[PDB]
Design a binder for this molecule. Structure first.
Ligand SMILES: O=C(NCCC(F)(F)F)c1ccc(-c2csc(CNS(=O)(=O)c3ccccc3)n2)cc1
Ligand SMILES: O=C(NCCC(F)(F)F)c1ccc(-c2csc(CNS(=O)(=O)c3ccccc3)n2)cc1
Lengths: 191, 191
């Protein structure tokens, strides 16, 4: 639609500059519509970023749902690698939306609440799998599962997103998946 | 001095509202000086937060230097707990400066560079200790030490600061030290 064109324009421009430096007029021009026509689709450029983030977050969530329904046939190291890889590939394929969406957590209650809702969901799912591993005798009962899950999820948020943004310091993007898998597997299966 | 009074006023006000909602006039009034007298001590309210952050960061750094010079007489779990505790206690004793200083990373190159410099230093020291543990045969050679150190340091930044801010999600403050120690010890000593 024109909606999909505004979203694509926003994602393209965000690869060059922050949302602060993008105007409604910029988004309209790229989508081949006028400013008032823009306001028919979105109330604000902040609504455009919220929608972009919502789509990327739901893409990751559905990928993880897909894996949870269809468990891959592998050792525990590859089970966790496959789950972390959802986030690495999904967010790493949308770096500009990731960077801008994280930055908007500071200024938008709707972005903060979106991020908070899905992090809670991914932590609860992490904990449920760690608890399943403990129930079947493959993982030791150490930390409370939900506390362990929370810190591992927060580690992944900061570490993946520092890598994608090329922050100093950061793990290089080509090393970050193996880095996180090591810490997940040792902390989940380690006495 | 009047300098110390401005710094104390800023830290007190930051416990109530963001730097965005604090004026130079607010800082002058609390310190018992006029606005132009304020500008004799600091160029801007942003300089006041930079100085507060610089003092808290250097306090943590010196505490860690103190431990590095005078190694406590304990098992490896208590060695790592004592190091992480520097950050938990130092930043956890200055939550308002922590929150505001992290938020200012987005808008101030000097705050971003301060934070980046010390994180590099703390990661290099982490890696140097992991490498010492590997050299003496107490830790296995798994991940490259500096990559492991980077992800553990970034985990601590996000997890400690989410706890202090009471974010949803977060580990409760009373559980966060034990949570992080578990993940450091298992990931550093785990095959
Ligand atoms: O990174 C994460 N969070 C942070 C997100 C960020 F960074 F902020 F973007 C994150 C990583 C992994 C999981 C997860 C849960 S359970 C599992 C195992 N795979 S599984 O059960 O789906 C599976 C995989 C393969 C075979 C069988 C089951 N992996 C959840 C969250
Ligand atoms: O949390 C950290 N970083 C993130 C900071 C944040 F969160 F962003 F604020 C952080 C935690 C621990 C260390 C560290 C290095 S080495 C050691 C062992 N203790 S030691 O060598 O100093 C020691 C202790 C006791 C006995 C002997 C030696 N601990 C470094 C950094």
């Amino acid at each position: 639609d024109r909606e999909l064109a505004i979203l694509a324009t926003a994602e393209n421009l965000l690869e060059d500059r922050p949302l602060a430096d993008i105007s409604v007029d910029d988004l309209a021009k790229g989508a081949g519509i006028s400013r008032p026509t823009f306001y028919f689709y979105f109330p604000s450029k902040e609504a455009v970023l919220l929608t972009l983030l919502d789509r990327v977050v739901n893409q990751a969530d559905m990928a993880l749902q897909t894996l949870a329904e269809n468990p891959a046939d592998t050792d525990r190291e590859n089970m966790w690698r496959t789950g972390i890889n959802v986030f690495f590939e999904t967010f790493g394929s949308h770096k500009a939306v990731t960077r801008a969406g994280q930055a908007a957590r500071a200024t938008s209650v709707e972005v903060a609440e979106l991020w908070s809702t899905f992090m809670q969901k991914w932590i609860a799912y992490t904990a449920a799998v760690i608890d399943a591993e403990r129930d079947r005798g493959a993982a030791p009962r150490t930390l409370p599962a939900h506390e362990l899950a929370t810190a591992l999820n927060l580690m992944n948020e900061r570490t993946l997103f520092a890598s994608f943004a090329g922050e100093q310091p950061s793990v290089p993007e080509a090393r970050v998946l193996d880095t996180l898998v090591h810490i997940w597997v040792t902390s989940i299966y380690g006495e």
